[PDB]
Design a protein around this ligand. Sequence first.
Ligand code: HEM
Ligand code: HEM
Ligand code: HEM
Ligand code: HEM
Ligand SMILES: CO[C@](c1ccc(Cl)cc1)(c1ccc2c(c1)c(-c1c(F)cccc1F)cc(=O)n2C)c1cncn1C
Ligand SMILES: CO[C@](c1ccc(Cl)cc1)(c1ccc2c(c1)c(-c1c(F)cccc1F)cc(=O)n2C)c1cncn1C
Lengths: 450, 450, 450, 450
Amino acid sequence: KGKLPPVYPVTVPILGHIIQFGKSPLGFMQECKRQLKSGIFTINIVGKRVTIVGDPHEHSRFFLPRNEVLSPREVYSFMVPVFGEGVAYAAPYPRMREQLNFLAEELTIAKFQNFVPAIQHEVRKFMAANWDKDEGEINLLEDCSTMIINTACQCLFGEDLRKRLDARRFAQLLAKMESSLIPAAVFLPILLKLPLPQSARCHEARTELQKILSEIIIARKEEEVNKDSSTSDLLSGLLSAVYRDGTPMSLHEVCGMIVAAMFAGQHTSSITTTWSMLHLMHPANVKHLEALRKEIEEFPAQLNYNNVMDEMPFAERCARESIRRDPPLLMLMRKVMADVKVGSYVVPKGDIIACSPLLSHHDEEAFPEPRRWDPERDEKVEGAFIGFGAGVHKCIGQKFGLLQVKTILATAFRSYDFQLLRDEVPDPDYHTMVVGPTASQCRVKYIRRK
Amino acid sequence: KGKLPPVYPVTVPILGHIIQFGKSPLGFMQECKRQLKSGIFTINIVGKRVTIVGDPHEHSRFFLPRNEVLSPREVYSFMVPVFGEGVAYAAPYPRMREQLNFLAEELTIAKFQNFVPAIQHEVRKFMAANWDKDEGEINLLEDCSTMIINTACQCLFGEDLRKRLDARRFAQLLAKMESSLIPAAVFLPILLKLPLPQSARCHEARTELQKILSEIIIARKEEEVNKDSSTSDLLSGLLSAVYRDGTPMSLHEVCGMIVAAMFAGQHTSSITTTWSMLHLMHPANVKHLEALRKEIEEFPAQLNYNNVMDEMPFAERCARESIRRDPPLLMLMRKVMADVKVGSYVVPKGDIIACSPLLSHHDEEAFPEPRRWDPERDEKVEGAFIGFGAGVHKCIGQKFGLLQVKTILATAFRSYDFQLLRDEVPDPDYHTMVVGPTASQCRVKYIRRK
Amino acid sequence: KGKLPPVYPVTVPILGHIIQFGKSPLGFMQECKRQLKSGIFTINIVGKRVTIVGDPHEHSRFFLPRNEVLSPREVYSFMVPVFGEGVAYAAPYPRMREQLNFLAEELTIAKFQNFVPAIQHEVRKFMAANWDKDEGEINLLEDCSTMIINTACQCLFGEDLRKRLDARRFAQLLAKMESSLIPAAVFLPILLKLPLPQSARCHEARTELQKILSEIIIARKEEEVNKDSSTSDLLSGLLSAVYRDGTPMSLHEVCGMIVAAMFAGQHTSSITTTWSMLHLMHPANVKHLEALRKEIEEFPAQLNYNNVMDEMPFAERCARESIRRDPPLLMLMRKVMADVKVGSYVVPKGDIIACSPLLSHHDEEAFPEPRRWDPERDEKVEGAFIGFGAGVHKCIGQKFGLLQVKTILATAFRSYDFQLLRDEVPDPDYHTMVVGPTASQCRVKYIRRK
Amino acid sequence: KGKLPPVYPVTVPILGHIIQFGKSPLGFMQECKRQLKSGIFTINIVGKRVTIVGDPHEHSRFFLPRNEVLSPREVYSFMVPVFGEGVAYAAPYPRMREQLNFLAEELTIAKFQNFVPAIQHEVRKFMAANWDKDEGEINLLEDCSTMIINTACQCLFGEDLRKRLDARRFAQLLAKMESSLIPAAVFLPILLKLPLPQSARCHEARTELQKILSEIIIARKEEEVNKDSSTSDLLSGLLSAVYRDGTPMSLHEVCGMIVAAMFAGQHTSSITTTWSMLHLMHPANVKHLEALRKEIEEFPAQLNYNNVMDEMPFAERCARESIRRDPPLLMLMRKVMADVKVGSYVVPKGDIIACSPLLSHHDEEAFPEPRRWDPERDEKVEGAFIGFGAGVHKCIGQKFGLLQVKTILATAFRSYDFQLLRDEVPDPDYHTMVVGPTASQCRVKYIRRK
Ligand code: HEM
Ligand code: HEM
Ligand code: HEM
Ligand code: HEM
Ligand SMILES: CO[C@](c1ccc(Cl)cc1)(c1ccc2c(c1)c(-c1c(F)cccc1F)cc(=O)n2C)c1cncn1C
Ligand SMILES: CO[C@](c1ccc(Cl)cc1)(c1ccc2c(c1)c(-c1c(F)cccc1F)cc(=O)n2C)c1cncn1C
């Protein structure tokens, strides 16, 4: 008609709903939905209006509008010290698009031919070193997370870079950058103006990463005209990029794109793999484990691009459904740059507008019995699954992430069985920025198959 | 006058002076002092009145009043997650005082007998493994920082504790805790109440540390009723503590005090040693270097208590003058709990009152040519030096800090000479919570001395 | 015409209209304005022609002409026993201007940097001492009037003066001066020549105040020589004034300007505050109370200059509308020293010309529904609001008075709610020299807000 | 001649003589007596003939004629706001007489049995609280005036009334009424018709007083119902008054008679006491001090009715001679309602006729050496003493006032000596409505006779 979305009653006058949300984001959001009789509704976070598009039939109103209407820039501004000035959403939108296209072109299926054996190579090296007995106890989340960083680095970076900057040194740098982030800055923008110790720690880590890239580039040139170097990887691909205006990507921007790529996939991919395995080993899912086993039954010892990309539709369903049930990114946000009509409401300029994969993936029309993990399900409302976003800002690394998840699944389950050390699959742990299964609950027995 | 101090005008709508303060802390405070023709004046940080006691003759008005009148509790609120609930300033003041007294008692000179060779052992091991060529290149700041944590842990903790938790693991846990902290929460206390990514990391680290300690204590208890040995350290010391009320220190508190001890001395002592060596190796100072060589000239290779405590008065002067010139802690603060007289003024209840070692150490009457490093100098206003604070909350760790600095200066300069890879002494880096010389400028070459 | 304004019929021959005016000043003036079908009309007070400029369109004809044309001296005659002979309107007009300029320099907004937290501190000290419970009953007029004198004195008098001449004592002296005045002397000029008992009491009080000022000055000069006697206040400021002819202000003149300043602000500023609180706490005005609450929502606990000066336009509207609806000064007067044009008419030399904030603030074109308190209204006739006068004799204390009102409003409604103990806002009491809400109708319940 | 009394020349026109009279009343009047060679003569007070009877032989011509012939109504008109409409001289004369009779009936010798102990109780309480050292300095006019209000209140009012309305609060209310009076209204009747700020303040004080009496009356009714008591005092006595026409006194009238009683005696009795003590303590009067001492040293510690009323002739002489020398009421007046013979002249209708205790008391035939204080003198012309008036309007409080004076004299000089802190007896201060010794000149040392 022309009215604002209904607003959930504020009881705590300075914090709003941040506390209820924090404690149980899904339960809280579902209560709002019920109490207000609407899938579109507004909550209050430290005094800021957050309008949630909690009706899957209306997702396109969030994902499809152009940047001049719904803008991610100010929402992702707390990440500027990580990406760098002029990198990603910080750059003007045409330029940001060019940068993200360059990244996407480093993740083409043509590059995937080499990725599959690089991934499988590192997975087997990990398994040989760590899962080496007849049977043993491990933390699956920790191990998947190691496999993901190692396989990613094996895929994206030449041996010279891995030497100087091994998955271990790389993780420490990225952890330093990450620990300095303050996502609360979205709702308290005053924080991006203050002096914080975080700024210096982040800039320290980013500068050191960029120095190591500089030294790698110089080392390659030393190899490079000798014909002794012709190392081709994500670093050299990005350095070869030329913007429409004729200019090359600066080292600064390359660094930023590499950091962005590593941040994007590190926890999400590793959480997707862990949940998938947790489900697949649970006795209730024995039928799904059999289907996976039949899917990979006749794969060669050394997997090829055809096996993983074209011949694992069921494992793909396992991964997507794990993200459907427990999406690692709970909430996507944009700044409303002009009034937008959404369902029967106007969401006013200056609002934050959000669409929550967590809430949408538990819409009971779209996903009946949403806590039941069922890889065979399909969304019952078109576009209801948004675990990788959609439209304007849809995930460009979706295929690369799934490639790693699927390769690990086929390699692990070909050689091992696993046994939960609990009756039920882990609870999600909502306390972190990227949400995965509770770490203390992820201990598992592996059993070598013979 | 008996009225409020002069207020420096705010031209930055909602930030106040916090920006100008960042660009140049000393320059800003001094301009204020000059433009207002007063050493006592009030600036504004994010809406908070901050009254600065910038007249060295008035130091006692900040450092001498009772807690009931000037309290640091609210100012150190942001550190509750590290120290823990009801530890140190969070506890009631008689109880606070009891806790700090127990810690100070673990740092008395009576403990120092064994400290000196325990510190030498660690220094020489580090130098052996890391400075083992005729000449090489190092980051002095990084290297002093390593020596300081290694020396501290060897002094403070028994072998068995050093087995489960070596210096590295310890430093890692301390860093995890530290990364979560925001000093600015002082001026935006709403931060203290928000569910943040940081709090989770912090709680986890303190909980892991506490868990490590609990298992050491159980191992000791059982290994004391079988009496193989007798571990005497910081830990056993705090454990043997009992309040006036009769009851012992809780494990929670013990762990809090250890953390406080570790954070307190980690950067400060390391920065003090580093500045000292940076000044001493400089050409402009070779005369001061000669006196040090002279002071330590007929000391034995196996240093003892008397050498360091009694026979290094000049080395001590070097360390103090390094702190004088570039104090690691720029600003000390209290909450004003009741109106207080300061100079001719009354600082009103509710103000934050501050006394700045940086501002005071550069008062030209008290320290002429403030920027010149001169270990033979003396303060020309009484109580002008406040590098370790004073009065009610004076540093309890200053003797132990100096013991570390002095032993290292003796031990390093005995075996080595050093050369600065810059014409000038490094600039101070004002971007960190504890201020030291700019780390990137601290590259130095070590020259063995045969 | 170029003839006289119309003349309201005189029935009571010798008193004229003074009885009718006294009973109901607004009613009576409005009835005149309706009946004669003219905003410019002449009434008769004790035999004297008084021409009222009651058409707001014609306000400039009263406020702009020079002193030599429209002269306030004769109308403010009755105030000479308080100001002193040769002070303010009693001095030649150029010297008068100099005196008022000196007083104005003592009230510049530059001084507001410190005035704001000085005022708020006095205000919190009163509320905490007198509104200390969770609810309770008070006469809001008496309380606002107490806060105003307390805050003025904090701002304007050095602490040596405040000790000798505290708020209670100062109010007693001013009351003894006030209670001796007879505005009617303007129309019965013989009264100024009789030795009435009012005359002696006025002289005693003014003398005792000058005696106190003199002792304070002498003590400052005794103790003076350093920059120690930097006591800097309204008194020392006026004492350093030097006229254009090179002579300094006498203590007689300084005393006069001080009395003038206190008289000017005392009742007016407290009435203005009292009304505002009365209108704001009225259930009818919740949309206004709400708007004040939003305007001040994000202020610090310690109001600062910027908060009050730059960030309270709405609160300022509330004060000005309260003065619009019930102006504390009902009637402004000049002696016509030469014939003057006003609208279609000539006001002859020798008349008293008047302009009435009461009447003009109720002109139904300029202020429709003028009995409705509407802080969001804007005047609809240019220059219609004359609560602080205008033109040659505009109020010089306006910003200072409003500064006090605004600081009390932000401080009051921040920590308290209020309930008015009657259905309607109090009636104005027209029987006093400065008009405020009827005191016995100003009983009110405060309620602490957690 | 012998038609009109001789008229003293007016040289200052619109004022006449009021200024000369004001400066030096006794001087100016005697000069008129001499200059015109007549004790009967007419001066001019702001255009108004005032015929003074300065010949004591002619006194009865002023004091005896009926109210209808010589009226005090218009002369005491200015006190209507204090007495109340329709009270005292404002009532019809027959009714005025009834009201005054009722007041007199409360001040008769039957009441005095209670009064003497009540007065002595208050005097002793005051001295024990204030004159409690071996010696000390006091202002005797202040202290006497304090004792007079405390003693009068203890005589005339039950303890219940004094609790709700104590001496201090009663004085403040009276003082508020007093300072609103303008005796000049006698000559400018216009003044009593105008709405003056003074008239408003007086109404406010009177109303608050009447309100307090109504509260006490109610509490008393409630006591009678308990029948714990029937509290008897001046209030209760006035309340049971019933006029000839059968109607009771209204609260309005009771309040008026009370206010009249307090005004009547407050300054007059307090001044009479103060003069008396001043004379008696002065070195020239030691014989009188000794005679006083001889008279009172024969009394018991608790004075009674007979002691003070029948056994203190010399003390009564001191008081009366103090009033003789310096009458507190300078000038008594009547409106002349019909021509009247005086001596050998006629005073025409419309004149104010006057008889001056100051002038008559200084007639050298009646009182040789009039500035000489001699309690042993008697008037040498019959009826020449008019300190308490005479005839139809003779003072009805005369006995009560002197009872107070004498009780104070006896109690003071019984236990104390005094020293004037001055060479001479203080000058009278003619500038107040009721005339006493100059207050600043009334500092005295008490010396305890231990
Ligand atoms: C399972 C693993 C992953 C998940 C669950 C995931 C999820 C998402 C989601 C939900 C969005 C939408 C964000 C929004 O709408 O604000 C997104 C966007 C994006 N993703 Fe991922 N992602 C994954 C892996 C990756 C990887 C491995 C990369 C890069 C190598 C990547 C690169 C990006 C980029 C650059 C965007 C922003 C696209 C744009 O703004 O145009 N993602 N991702
Ligand atoms: C060069 C090394 C050090 C420097 C420059 C330093 C500096 C300071 C300063 C300036 C203060 C006063 C804080 C205030 O007024 O708010 C302080 C207090 C304190 N210091 Fe240190 N410190 C050093 C080493 C240490 C060490 C090694 C420890 C313990 C292991 C320690 C423990 C403490 C404690 C517990 C307080 C608070 C005492 C109280 O509140 O009563 N310090 N230090
Ligand atoms: C709500 C507070 C106040 C109100 C409503 C008010 C009102 C007025 C008005 C109506 C006039 C014009 C008088 C006329 O034209 O005859 C005036 C003039 C004046 N006011 Fe105020 N006033 C306030 C506060 C103050 C204060 C605090 C001061 C000084 C401390 C002050 C000082 C003066 C002076 C000196 C004039 C005469 C200006 C001249 O003749 O040039 N006023 N004020
Ligand atoms: C030393 C103390 C007093 C002195 C010197 C004094 C003096 C006088 C004088 C001179 C008159 C005549 C007024 C005239 O003729 O116009 C008078 C009348 C009067 N006095 Fe007093 N008075 C004193 C105390 C009192 C007291 C204590 C009361 C009662 C409390 C009182 C009640 C009255 C009344 C009611 C009248 C008017 C009588 C009438 O009009 O019939 N007086 N007094
Ligand atoms: C940086 O990773 C992003 C990304 C965003 C934009 C661009 Cl150009 C590139 C990458 C991304 C996206 C949404 C995010 C976050 C991060 C984070 C987040 C954080 F803030 C810090 C650390 C880790 C985090 F996942 C919290 C969050 O709430 N949302 C919605 C990404 C993309 N694909 C998967 N990821 C994870
Ligand atoms: C003295 O206060 C004045 C003022 C006037 C001139 C100068 Cl040089 C300085 C001050 C002022 C002005 C007009 C006044 C009055 C007083 C008074 C008045 C009084 F007569 C006694 C007590 C209180 C009174 F307000 C009755 C009156 O009718 N008018 C029009 C002032 C200025 N701003 C606010 N005020 C109040």
